[PDB]
């Protein structure tokens with residue numbers, strides 16, 4: 126008769142991390158990769174012998190910065206001359222070249238100099254997400270929904286589809302990240318009547334606020350706002366500067382010029398930062414940090430909160446701006462949705478909850494997984510081919 130159909134997948138193709146889910150047995154499974162990670166770094170590294178993707182690429186970045194590519198999403202569908210591209214290039218250790226006013230990343234790979242379009246790098250990340258899904262399902266996957274920021278234009282959306290096609294995926298649809306997060310919570314399944322939904326998306330490097338109106342399952346993007354210079358990495362930076370000062374006071378030594386020491390400090394700071402989302406304090410223990418000096422210290426959640434206080438408060442400016450643009454008052458928002466790992470920060474949650482006069486925040490779906498979750502829900506809907514009964 127008719128052979129069983131393979132499940133379709135939902136992929137959040139993120140700037141820093143990507144996530145893949147599948148809707149089966151009436152529920153979403155967010156699929157861990159073979160290192161046990163439910164999210165995979167959107168990184169690709171090139172050596173004389175290998176092309177590494179995901180954790181393997183991010184884990185060797187320290188010594189291979191010129192040939193480890195990340196942030197390709199910031200280049201996707203953009204012109205080389207775009208001022209965003211020109212500014213971003215100053216922060217990247219890898220080379221970005223101009224090919225007909227289209228950016229390409231240029232690396233050393235398998236004995237040669239090779240340049241790739243951003244969609245080619247993203248296709249490599251998509252190939253890894255497809256393989257992660259296939260390792261769990263135990264069969265080849267063909268169909269996928271891929272998400273993008275609501276602000277992506279036609280060129281950025283087409284270049285994302287192109288990345289999916291290069292990876293051998295059939296792209297069912299390109300859907301907006303805030304829309305996918307709303308779908309994850311079933312906010313399009315509440316029946317008749319308008320619902321105003323605010324998506325609060327705090328990433329590693331950027332912050333996006335979106336206001337959507339949902340009416341009879343139909344989504345309309347009412348307003349987008351944000352801060353391109355606000356993310357998790359800025360909180361890590363504040364902790365780094367704090368501990369550099371602390372080492373200076375305690376040992377009368379400036380570590381800031383030993384790249385390894387600074388990197389080991391940043392790595393420990395990011396983990397201490399995550400611990401502080403669940404505990405009121407966190408220890409920091411680094412052996413032989415600088416000149417054989419062991420750095421054994423601690424930081425309270427209160428001190429971390431004070432260190433990033435202005436940054437956390439600044440998340441409310443794009444919220445107020447988006448509300449003005451949507452011509453809505455805060456009480457008129459029915460649902461608040463958290464997206465991004467940085468939203469696990471209790472102080473960030475409290476500031477936003479206080480702004481919306483004590484309202485509950487939807488955070489029950491892991492915020493770094495909600496976009497893939499919604500994309501997986503939609504992918505299963507899009508492949509249905511029910512024929513009506515008489």
Ligand SMILES: Nc1ncnc2c1nc(Br)n2[C@@H]1O[C@H](CO)[C@@H](O)[C@H]1O
Pocket residue numbers: 141142328329330356357358395398399400402465466467468469470493
């Ligand atoms: N529990 C957590 N508490 C605070 N921050 C977190 C957490 N989990 C994740 Br994931 N992050 C941060 O999210 C960003 C994703 O690119 C990075 O800055 C991560 O450090």
Ligand SMILES: [Mg+2]
Pocket residue numbers: 137139140302328465496
């Ligand atoms: Mg995201």
